[PDB]
């Protein structure tokens, strides 16, 4: 049975830490002592901690701390470092490296009702967008104008999430 | 007629009844209002008294009746002649 553990890396080199960790596993061939390795890296939460399915021998502990650009485990003590949970890393798994935003046929920025318009007349302005015309690349952001809530057809690039 | 992709139509309840009858091996007539129901291969042999608006008229199902619907064998209007 392999339980989960938290590894701290130099924040920003996290995907390279994950790749080097998989490679150190397949070098020192303790293949039966490692299950998975979650190391996200957006163009990113959590952009600083690497989740490792593992068991605890002192050999595997020295292995993970001999992986380069790794500070150490995070637990109660450094003798016997602490597991956490499977659900904690579970959330990260879903969006580990899945196509998040970016490559989209319409929405370039989360609509909801929080955006700012700058590529137009609305100099340093923000408003709430109820409906949106992504198909025809149009937004109905209701910016506080004329003492009310009148919307204005804005451009996706013109506005900013 | 109905689209081939949609399949044949039979009322669910009617179908269930038919199934029950089959299970039993009984030949007592099943009174039914589903005139819109298509006849099925398993319904062959059964008497099924189809409503014509007014009364249930007994229809002994045959090999030839399969593709047809139950309402086809239960005429509603009752015209004898003008003289």
């Amino acid at each position: 049975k392999k339980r989960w553990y938290v590894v701290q890396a130099f924040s920003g080199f996290e995907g390279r830490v994950a790749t080097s960790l998989r490679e150190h596993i397949k070098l020192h061939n303790m293949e039966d002592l490692f299950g998975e390795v979650m190391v996200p890296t957006e163009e990113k939460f959590f952009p600083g901690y690497v989740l490792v399915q593992m068991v605890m021998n002192d050999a595997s502990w020295h292995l993970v701390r001999s992986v380069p650009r790794v500070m150490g485990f995070i637990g109660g003590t450094s003798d016997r470092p602490a597991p956490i949970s499977d659900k904690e890393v579970d959330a990260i798994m879903n969006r580990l490296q899945q196509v998040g935003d970016k490559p989209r046929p319409k929405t370039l920025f989360e609509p909801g009702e929080m955006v700012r318009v700058n590529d137009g007349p609305f100099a340093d302005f923000n408003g709430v967008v109820e409906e949106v015309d992504y198909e025809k690349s149009r937004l109905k952001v209701s910016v506080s104008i004329f003492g009310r809530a009148t919307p204005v057809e804005l451009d996706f690039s013109q506005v900013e999430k | 007629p109905r689209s081939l992709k949609k399949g044949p139509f039979i009322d669910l309840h009617l179908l269930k009844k038919v199934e029950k009858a089959v299970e039993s091996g009984d030949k007592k007539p099943l009174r039914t209002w589903s005139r819109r129901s298509t006849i099925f291969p398993n319904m062959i042999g059964l008497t099924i008294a189809v409503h014509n608006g007014r009364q249930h008229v007994p229809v002994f199902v045959t090999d030839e009746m399969v593709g047809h619907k139950l309402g086809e064998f239960a005429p509603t209007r009752t015209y004898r002649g003008h003289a």
Partner: protein, 208 residues
């Protein structure tokens, strides 16, 4: 059903609209319905108050009502007590922020609708219809109407055979589009049946 409606034929020229808003095909029907509701409510409420014309005007998701009434005092009641009360109910009816204005009708004898209403009331309280009609006509004339016509119809004096009678005074040109013809109607729900009252009041011709 010979005659064209005198208000309706003149909306483009000398008469204005009551409901005065723009809406796309989406929200138009709903708006109309709302207007109907609010107007109905107002009529129900301000029956005892002499009310001529409710003018609805909705800009920017907020309804502006304008009540034309002969006596504001009974519609307003105490210093913004009754008006305020009316407002919230109006808002509720609409589903938007409400604003009630109250226009004071100068010369209620020259306002046609008001006159009609009065006549109806008279009929209801069992006066001689003819005498009422005469009063209506005379009063308007006195007040400075270029002309007036009034017409009442059906079960007059509770008679079995219904008929219509009408009194004209001065000139009341209906074919002339530029004539300011204040037309309006009412209905007396008497013991013998309904008695419909029409009244045309010719203020004068507009030159433009």
């Amino acid at each position: 059903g010979q005659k064209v409606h005198p208000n309706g034929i003149r909306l483009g020229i000398v008469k204005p609209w009551n409901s005065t808003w723009f809406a796309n095909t989406k929200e138009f029907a709903d708006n109309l319905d709302s207007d109907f509701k609010v107007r109905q409510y107002l009529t129900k409420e301000l029956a005892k108050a002499s009310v001529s014309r409710i003018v609805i005007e909705r800009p920017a998701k907020s309804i502006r009502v304008t009540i034309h009434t002969a006596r504001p005092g009974i519609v307003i009641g105490k210093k913004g007590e009754d008006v305020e009360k009316l407002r919230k109910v109006v808002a509720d009816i609409a589903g938007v922020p409400a604003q009630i204005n109250i226009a004071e009708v100068r010369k209620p004898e020259l306002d046609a609708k008001l006159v009609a209403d009065s006549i109806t009331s008279q009929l209801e309280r069992r006066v001689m219809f003819r005498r009422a009609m005469k009063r209506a006509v005379q009063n308007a004339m006195r007040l400075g109407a270029k002309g007036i016509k009034v017409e009442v119809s059906g079960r007059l004096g509770g008679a079995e055979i219904a008929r219509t009678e009408w009194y004209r005074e001065g000139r009341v040109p209906l074919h002339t589009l530029r004539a300011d013809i204040d037309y309006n109607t009412s209905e007396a729900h008497t013991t013998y049946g309904v008695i419909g009252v029409k009244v045309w009041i010719f203020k004068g011709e507009i030159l433009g």
